[PDB]
RNA sequence: GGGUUGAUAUGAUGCCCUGACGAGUAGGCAGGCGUGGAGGUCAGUGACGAAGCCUAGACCGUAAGGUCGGGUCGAACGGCC
RNA sequence: AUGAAGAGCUUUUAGUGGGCCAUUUUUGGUAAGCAGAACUGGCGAUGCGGGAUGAACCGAACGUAGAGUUAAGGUGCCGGA
RNA sequence: GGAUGCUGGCAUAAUGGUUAUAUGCCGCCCGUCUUGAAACACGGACCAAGGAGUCUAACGUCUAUGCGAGUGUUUGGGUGUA
RNA sequence: GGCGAGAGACCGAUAGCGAACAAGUACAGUGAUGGAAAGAUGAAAAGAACUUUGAAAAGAGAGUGAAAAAGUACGUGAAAUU
């Protein structure tokens, strides 16, 4: 429960904060968990997400499905994934928006910065 | 509150308990104490007589601390003594140990005779007293001794 | 206006008192800020009374 | 714009709705208006009488 | 120590616990005790007989 | 039809079953109405009504009043009964040993009585000791001692205390109150 | 299954309708008293609607009863029903309107087992 | 002659240690008073609403 | 106006008996129906469909109004103090 | 004598403070469905039966039903007799 | 000091209710000020939604509650899960 | 008032600031000044491929969708009126 004063308990403020949150805050909100393998292998629960991570969907009608990220649409608060598409009656294809709260990772896309972030959050590599 | 209310019981009835002829209008008799020497004169002479006119002498810059003179009657005059020592003195209603009472320290300025203390001596300290009060005290065997 | 036996009343509300009302809703927060100030002053003059 | 001036209509009805009660009568009525001489002496006499009866049933 | 009792004071100044105006609540026990029942007259059958 | 010589469906004008929602008082009323119904006792009926009574028709009764009553003849070893409250009065210095029964007792009065060697009693204890009003004595306190009864009935030539907030010179001590300023009442 | 009741008289089966409920759509049938001054309904003229009053009230022994002779009592669950367990000959159950079909099925089976009557035993049945 | 009160442990069942009752529970029990006082004391946590 | 705490069982503001009476504007008082929100309780109903809306379909109440069924719809809502 | 349906007492507060009709008494006026008073009863504030019709007239005053008997008014038919 | 007995038929839309219509009799448009409104007095074409004795200061009677010759914690201070 | 924070027995799109939206906006007036209306598809546009009638708009099919009794004249969809 809340015990400070600089913390808002208002639906109104939290909602407009979330919706007018800019792209960096949106990254941190679009964080996603790790699978059991990577959680044990790196030492971390969850993480921000980006454009060439590999990932598994565990909620929805695309439940059970794997792929690699193709775009992170932060404006829409969503993630567009290759191999996860809708086939339009005009013989076409469309990517399907998802949420990184429901995604789960199988394999990352690493860099100096993600590695430093892990060593920051207390991981083992 | 608003739900225990005859407004809420008037709803539907037309004039809200004010009438159809008499027509609750704004100020048909005037405002305030208007017309006390006129169309409200009966009321002012029957219920509030003395209202019109001046009687006495003006006192500029008056002070109700010059006029501080609270009263105490002999009826009580032991309420100032606790119950812890009251019965002690009243049974040892004797001399050379007479209880002393500072009415002023208690919050009083004058002493009055509303009646019939016991026959025990007391010593009373006060700014003012009444003749009868003191006669009763020293008839009981006590005394008054004045102060500022 | 004058009516049945009721004491004469002197209610001085013939001006814009509802432009000038003060309602001390801040009784409490003002107490609390007085206390915080006392505490900070004491910590500023720490040994002193 | 004239009017009706006076009428005694309906007043008996109202009276007798809540009406004509006799005022009342007591033992020992008031001595207001009586000769003060008589009042004075009656006072002294009642004092004497009470004194006497009290001493008698003492 | 705080609300007091018969023998100690409460530590709230000028406070003595509120007093009962009735010694108990089993008014039925009172009614049926013995002495009421001695002074009481007998009773009807709780549902008067329809006559006429 | 009917040519009514009365008012129809009119209430008695008498309180039954008070609108105090105090459950203990209602218990007392259940008790004493049983007792009034069966013990053929006017005292029970009296107490029942006086329990229905309001706060101001239930004034206080000073222990000094009680003492006058016990200073009556043939009334010393009696049991005093007050439906209301009993107040202390330090305008007296002695007090007898009797027992007193009543709803409420100011702590000072209770102390005074207990110190004099009596006992302060509730009406249920009274109902077990003296159901028919054995050896009792009822007291009621003053009602016309009230600062609204001063103003009740205010008119000329009654001497009846106008309704007024502030007192003194220049508050209703003028026209109407002396023959110089027109007339005296 | 009910209890011996007397014969049921209602004294007005026809509904009390607001005056001009038929004439103006803004005036609805929910009964509402003409407080007017020249209202023949308030004046009880002949050939006008009958106003409600306490003489139309019902006999206490038949009041609140359905034709079955039962008093209706609303249930939302087996618990509210088990409350009615021992008063089947006087009280009957109305399953609420917001209940789901499966809970209705449950309640109906339980009421059958316990010998309790139900006055809406067809809500949300397909077939 | 307060009856007694048995103490329980943190591990459940009971103990031999026991207590009297503090004689506040012998106080009268008035829901009318509770109701009034509750209405007011629950009114007393309220912020001001108002219009422009 | 009365009767009835008596034990087992329920409701004492309850139950029961007897008698009389019932016009109504303004107006007064009382007992209630209903709406928005609040504290509490129903370990309340609910996407197997909440509320809302339609229903010369049913039921209760003198009535305000309440409940139910059928249809529509889609996310919250009621009973009691 | 008759009756008493309880007698007394207080507080407080609403609405009202335009009035009108009939019998009888009656004033001004040619008189008026005029104006102005008196006693009572009524309308207002009141439906019902009768008066074809009508605020007041006659009869009668009203909870919801049933049965019976009447009031005033009537019994050629409309319209029960 | 309040109706029981005997028998029959039906056991269903038969009774009954709702509803529409027909028939007989009655039935002037509501609200309003008004002595008096169906008025040849006013407002109203219709529907929805909004829409009018509230809040405060100081008071009177009355009724509940607490204490009681005293009463009032809550200007303020202390303390706090604020 | 300004800047920054927290809360509510407040209003819930005819309410609440005039303004929940490209509101001191459009718009009017010479000008001072005046001063609106207007929220909601759907979880996701998957916003209707293709065929056919028609000059076309649109229609009928098809199809998407849990639902077109959700088709940008989009939540539900009352009444007057039709």
From Swiss-Prot, chain B:
Region (Disordered): 1-38
Family, similarity comment: Belongs to the universal ribosomal protein uL15 family.
Function description: Component of the ribosome, a large ribonucleoprotein complex responsible for the synthesis of proteins in the cell. The small ribosomal subunit (SSU) binds messenger RNAs (mRNAs) and translates the encoded message by selecting cognate aminoacyl-transfer RNA (tRNA) molecules. The large subunit (LSU) contains the ribosomal catalytic site termed the peptidyl transferase center (PTC), which catalyzes the formation of peptide bonds, thereby polymerizing the amino acids delivered by tRNAs into a polypeptide chain.
Subunit record text: Component of the large ribosomal subunit (LSU). Mature yeast ribosomes consist of a small (40S) and a large (60S) subunit. The 40S small subunit contains 1 molecule of ribosomal RNA (18S rRNA) and 33 different proteins (encoded by 57 genes). The large 60S subunit contains 3 rRNA molecules (25S, 5.8S and 5S rRNA) and 46 different proteins (encoded by 81 genes).
Gene Ontology CC annotation, any one: nucleus
Annotated S-S bridges: none
Localization of this protein: Cytoplasm
SUPFAM superfamilies, alphabetized: Ribosomal proteins L15p and L18e
Source organism (scientific name): Saccharomyces cerevisiae (strain ATCC 204508 / S288c)
Effect of residue 37 to E: Confers resistance to cycloheximide, an inhibitor of polypeptide elongation
Superkingdom, taxonomy of origin: Eukaryota
Keywords: Cytoplasm, Isopeptide bond, Ribonucleoprotein, Ribosomal protein, Ubl conjugation
Protein name as annotated: Large ribosomal subunit protein uL15
Cross-link (Glycyl lysine isopeptide (Lys-Gly) (interchain with G-Cter in ubiquitin)): 95
UniProtKB/Swiss-Prot annotation, chain C:
Membrane-spanning residues: none
Coiled coil: none
Compartment annotation: Cytoplasm
Additional notes on this entry: Present with 133000 molecules/cell in log phase SD medium. There are 2 genes for eL13 in yeast.
Protein family per UniProt: Belongs to the eukaryotic ribosomal protein eL13 family.
Subunit-structure text: Component of the large ribosomal subunit (LSU). Mature yeast ribosomes consist of a small (40S) and a large (60S) subunit. The 40S small subunit contains 1 molecule of ribosomal RNA (18S rRNA) and 33 different proteins (encoded by 57 genes). The large 60S subunit contains 3 rRNA molecules (25S, 5.8S and 5S rRNA) and 46 different proteins (encoded by 81 genes).
Free-text function comment from the UniProt entry: Component of the ribosome, a large ribonucleoprotein complex responsible for the synthesis of proteins in the cell. The small ribosomal subunit (SSU) binds messenger RNAs (mRNAs) and translates the encoded message by selecting cognate aminoacyl-transfer RNA (tRNA) molecules. The large subunit (LSU) contains the ribosomal catalytic site termed the peptidyl transferase center (PTC), which catalyzes the formation of peptide bonds, thereby polymerizing the amino acids delivered by tRNAs into a polypeptide chain.
Protein name (database record): Large ribosomal subunit protein eL13A
Organism field: Saccharomyces cerevisiae (strain ATCC 204508 / S288c)
Organism classification: Eukaryota, Fungi, Dikarya, Ascomycota, Saccharomycotina
First and last residues shown, out of full length: 2 to 50 of 199
UniProtKB/Swiss-Prot annotation, chain E:
UniProt modification remark: N-terminally acetylated by acetyltransferase NatA.
Annotated signal peptide: none
Subcellular location: Cytoplasm; Nucleus
Described purpose of this protein according to its UniProt entry: Component of the ribosome, a large ribonucleoprotein complex responsible for the synthesis of proteins in the cell. The small ribosomal subunit (SSU) binds messenger RNAs (mRNAs) and translates the encoded message by selecting cognate aminoacyl-transfer RNA (tRNA) molecules. The large subunit (LSU) contains the ribosomal catalytic site termed the peptidyl transferase center (PTC), which catalyzes the formation of peptide bonds, thereby polymerizing the amino acids delivered by tRNAs into a polypeptide chain.
Family statement drawn from the similarity comment of this UniProt entry: Belongs to the universal ribosomal protein uL4 family.
Further remarks about this protein from its record: There are 2 genes for uL4 in yeast.
Subunit structure comment from the entry: Component of the large ribosomal subunit (LSU). Mature yeast ribosomes consist of a small (40S) and a large (60S) subunit. The 40S small subunit contains 1 molecule of ribosomal RNA (18S rRNA) and 33 different proteins (encoded by 57 genes). The large 60S subunit contains 3 rRNA molecules (25S, 5.8S and 5S rRNA) and 46 different proteins (encoded by 81 genes). uL4 is associated with the polypeptide exit tunnel. uL4 interacts with its chaperone ACL4 and the nuclear import receptor KAP104.
Protein name: Large ribosomal subunit protein uL4A
UniProtKB/Swiss-Prot annotation, chain F:
GO MF annotations, alphabetized: RNA binding; structural constituent of ribosome
Gene: RPL18A
GO biological process per UniProt: cytoplasmic translation
Top-level lineage group: Eukaryota
Gene3D superfamilies: 3.100.10.10
Main location, first listed in the record: cytoplasm
Keywords: Cytoplasm, Isopeptide bond, Methylation, Ribonucleoprotein, Ribosomal protein, Ubl conjugation
InterPro entries referenced in this protein's UniProt entry, alphabetically: Ribosomal_eL18 (IPR000039), Ribosomal_eL18/eL18-A/B/_CS (IPR021132), Ribosomal_uL15/eL18 (IPR021131), Ribosomal_uL15/eL18_sf (IPR036227)
Family per similarity comment: Belongs to the eukaryotic ribosomal protein eL18 family.
Gene Ontology CC terms: cytosol; cytosolic large ribosomal subunit
Protein name (database record): Large ribosomal subunit protein eL18A
Organism: Saccharomyces cerevisiae (strain ATCC 204508 / S288c) (Baker's yeast)
Misc. remarks from the entry: There are 2 genes for eL18 in yeast.
Residue location of crosslink Glycyl lysine isopeptide (Lys-Gly) (interchain with G-Cter in ubiquitin): 115
N6,N6,N6-trimethyllysine modification, residue list: 49
PROSITE patterns according to UniProt: RIBOSOMAL_L18E
Function text: Component of the ribosome, a large ribonucleoprotein complex responsible for the synthesis of proteins in the cell. The small ribosomal subunit (SSU) binds messenger RNAs (mRNAs) and translates the encoded message by selecting cognate aminoacyl-transfer RNA (tRNA) molecules. The large subunit (LSU) contains the ribosomal catalytic site termed the peptidyl transferase center (PTC), which catalyzes the formation of peptide bonds, thereby polymerizing the amino acids delivered by tRNAs into a polypeptide chain.
Locations listed in the record: Cytoplasm
Stored SUPFAM superfamilies: Ribosomal proteins L15p and L18e
Disulfide bonds: none
One Pfam entry name: Ribosomal_L18
